[PDB]
């Protein structure tokens, strides 16, 4: 579903091949790859559907980024680095950990300087260790002057126009992601609009529309893994998650200079290609446009997801305990709505 | 569970016997019968638990009421009379009928003068017809002068004190109920506090506490039979309603001069005794006391019922269609909270 691997310029061969993609149980179809000047691209972003833009130059100055350059210039701030035994780096919200004492995270977060991160990578590589690391840090004003120049050299003209055109809210942050080959961020949805700017290496992105909520089984909203799918894509439990047999994804492989629009509330699964080396991405997260004063029916799928989130949140507050939300919901439906 | 039939004064024999009670699948225990001067009675009404008060004199002037007296004096207003093929007079909300076109009521409502109601009773009796009628009309200012005198002669001193003592809201109405022997009002709960004043004949009252919500399976809040149990007490469907096998009722038989406190949100099933003649009741419905400014946890069962009602109401309004509430609730729980 990703599509035929693109041929690199100057007869450099296929950028990647299918053997670097993980194997899953569901079909996919390709996300369109278009020029930012293509009116179809503007039609997909306006309809809140995904598209890969090949020529935005959004992060053109960062395409020279590698570990050496970043370590030399990214400053001496702290970087959040996640470590795991497994390739799956499931996100967890540490604030919500108090609610569920039973949950024990597969991955661990450690704060370190950028040179320490590079050192751990080298150490793991040198000893042939199985540990995996994923660096995930929002860009902030502690970065070095060269990085500031690169950041200023992003294509703000194009993306500010997009923000204005769509009525989106403010840019909330830019997340720097540096991963090891084979790293996976499991399926989840975010609440903000995202322009996903690939810099180094290749990432396979599998997206699912908001109307596949009933096939992805997100954790309860109060659980630390709120917004993530409960389904283990590598070993799906069809008895607990029967409608995962009905999921269909939208797939693409993004490379240096590609920008993927991940619309808000769209599920996405992101994996750095096997044996593809390290990957570098910077995303651009924007608050969604304000809800219109006059709500129009029929509601969009993501509006219904928002309703469900808000019901779960209200019940948790009203009952005084997040653990009680499940029992009350079952009491409400059993023999009444099922 | 009703208790031994009481012996009538002056050696008149048992007022009723067990053979006049319908047979059901669940156990019961008796509602306490106490004097209004008994501090235990005041303790049960303050804790919102049911009690039968034997000596309130609440409707003492109405104990002389029969069909002849009422027809002569109740005026020429219209009375709501319900007619049914079966003994079960399931209440339905006519405003909510638009939401469910499929629902067809077992009983029919007709407006008529009191003498027409007495005539239908006589006609049915004379021809030995199987039709059943239940008169259910709130008292209003069209009543005759003698009825006004009787109404004024109720024990307002005692019940106004109760209203003040419990912090209840206003008296909202007095419902006059005249039924045929064997008539049944199926299990349901009301949202208002109720003093249930028996006048003529005997009624078996089976009550269930609000915490048995999960065993009584009320209809959806937007369904015309909102607040009524879906379970057919005469032929319970344990596959759809498995926890009806766990219901336990509180039972009593009220007679002329008895007043039953039916606390708000308490389920009640009310049947006029087989072969006991017509029954006459007047109830006293009061708005519950205002919710306290500081909510205290743990929540009461009826507060959790109120939460569920309000969730169902909000979703119906938000989705724009009452039919969609069931599907969204299932989507929210399946594989997530069950």
């Amino acid at each position: 579903g990703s599509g035929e691997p693109r041929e690199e310029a100057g007869a450099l061969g296929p950028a990647w091949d299918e053997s670097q993609l993980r194997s899953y149980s569901f079909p996919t179809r390709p996300i369109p790859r278009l020029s930012q000047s293509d009116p179809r691209a503007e039609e997909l972003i306006e309809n809140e559907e995904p598209v890969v833009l090949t020529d935005t130059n959004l992060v053109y100055p960062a395409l020279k980024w590698d570990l050496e350059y970043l370590q030399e210039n990214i400053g001496n701030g702290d970087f959040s680095v996640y470590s795991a035994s497994t390739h799956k780096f499931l996100y967890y919200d540490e604030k919500k950990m108090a609610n569920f004492q039973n949950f024990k995270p597969r991955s661990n977060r450690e704060e370190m300087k950028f040179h320490e991160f590079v050192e751990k990578l080298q150490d793991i590589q040198q000893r042939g260790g199985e540990e995996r690391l994923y660096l995930q840090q929002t860009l902030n004003d502690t970065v070095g002057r060269k990085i500031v120049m690169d950041f200023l050299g992003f294509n703000w003209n194009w993306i500010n126009k997009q923000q204005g055109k769509r009525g989106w809210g403010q840019l909330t942050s830019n997340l720097l992601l540096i991963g090891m080959e084979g790293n996976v961020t499991p399926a989840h949805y975010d609440e903000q609009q995202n322009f996903f700017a690939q810099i180094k290496g290749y990432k396979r992105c599998i997206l699912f529309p908001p109307d596949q909520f009933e096939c992805l089984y997100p954790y309860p909203v109060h659980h630390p893994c709120d917004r993530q799918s409960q389904v283990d894509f590598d070993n799906p439990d069809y008895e607990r998650f029967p409608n995962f047999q009905n999921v269909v994804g939208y797939e693409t492989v993004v490379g240096p200079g590609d920008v993927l629009y991940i619309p808000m509330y769209w599920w996405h699964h992101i994996e750095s290609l096997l044996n593809g080396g390290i990957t570098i991405t910077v995303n651009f997260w924007y608050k969604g446009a304000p809800t219109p004063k006059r709500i129009e029916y029929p509601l969009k799928a993501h509006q219904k997801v928002a309703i469900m989130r808000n019901i779960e949140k209200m019940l948790g507050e009203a009952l005084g305990n997040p653990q009680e939300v499940g029992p009350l919901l079952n009491t409400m439906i059993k023999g009444r709505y099922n | 569970g009703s208790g031994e039939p009481r012996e009538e004064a002056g050696a008149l024999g048992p007022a009723w016997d067990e053979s006049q009670l319908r047979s059901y699948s669940f156990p019961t225990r008796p509602i306490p019968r106490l004097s209004q001067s008994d501090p235990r009675a005041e303790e049960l009404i303050e804790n919102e638990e049911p009690v039968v008060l034997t000596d309130t004199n609440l409707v003492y002037p109405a104990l002389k009421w029969d069909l002849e007296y009422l027809q002569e004096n109740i005026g020429n207003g219209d009375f709501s009379v319900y007619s049914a093929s079966t003994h079960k007079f399931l209440y339905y909300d006519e405003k909510k009928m638009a939401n469910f076109q499929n629902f067809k009521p077992r009983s029919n409502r007709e407006e008529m003068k009191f003498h027409e109601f007495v005539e239908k009773l006589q006609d049915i009796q004379q021809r030995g017809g199987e039709e059943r009628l239940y008169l259910q009309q709130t008292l209003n200012d069209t009543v005759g002068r003698k009825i006004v005198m009787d109404f004024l002669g109720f024990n307002w001193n005692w019940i106004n004190k109760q209203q003040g003592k419990r912090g209840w809201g206003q008296l909202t109405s007095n419902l006059l109920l005249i039924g045929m022997e064997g008539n049944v009002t199926p299990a349901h709960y009301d949202e208002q506090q109720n003093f249930f004043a028996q006048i003529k004949g005997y009624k078996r009252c089976i009550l269930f506490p609000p915490d048995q919500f999960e065993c009584l399976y009320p209809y959806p809040v937007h369904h015309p039979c909102d607040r009524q149990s879906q379970v057919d007490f005469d032929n319970p469907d344990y596959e759809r309603f498995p926890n009806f096998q766990n219901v336990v009722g509180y039972e009593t038989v009220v007679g002329p001069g008895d007043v039953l406190y039916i606390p708000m949100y308490w389920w009640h099933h009310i049947e006029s005794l087989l072969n006991g003649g017509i029954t006459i009741t007047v109830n006293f419905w009061y708005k519950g006391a205002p919710t306290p400014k500081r909510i205290e946890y743990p929540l009461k069962a009826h507060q959790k019922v109120a939460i569920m009602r309000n969730i169902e109401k909000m979703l119906g309004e938000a989705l724009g269609n009452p039919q969609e509430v069931g599907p969204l609730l299932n989507t929210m729980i399946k594989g997530r909270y069950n």
């Binding site: 995930q136 903000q192 509006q303 928002a306 309703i307 019901i311 | 938000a318």
Partner: peptide
């Protein structure tokens, strides 16, 4: 309705 359809800004980051 407008209250219910409101959306947050939560993402996989602090």
């Amino acid at each position: 309705v407008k209250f219910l359809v409101q959306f947050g800004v939560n993402v996989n980051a602090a």
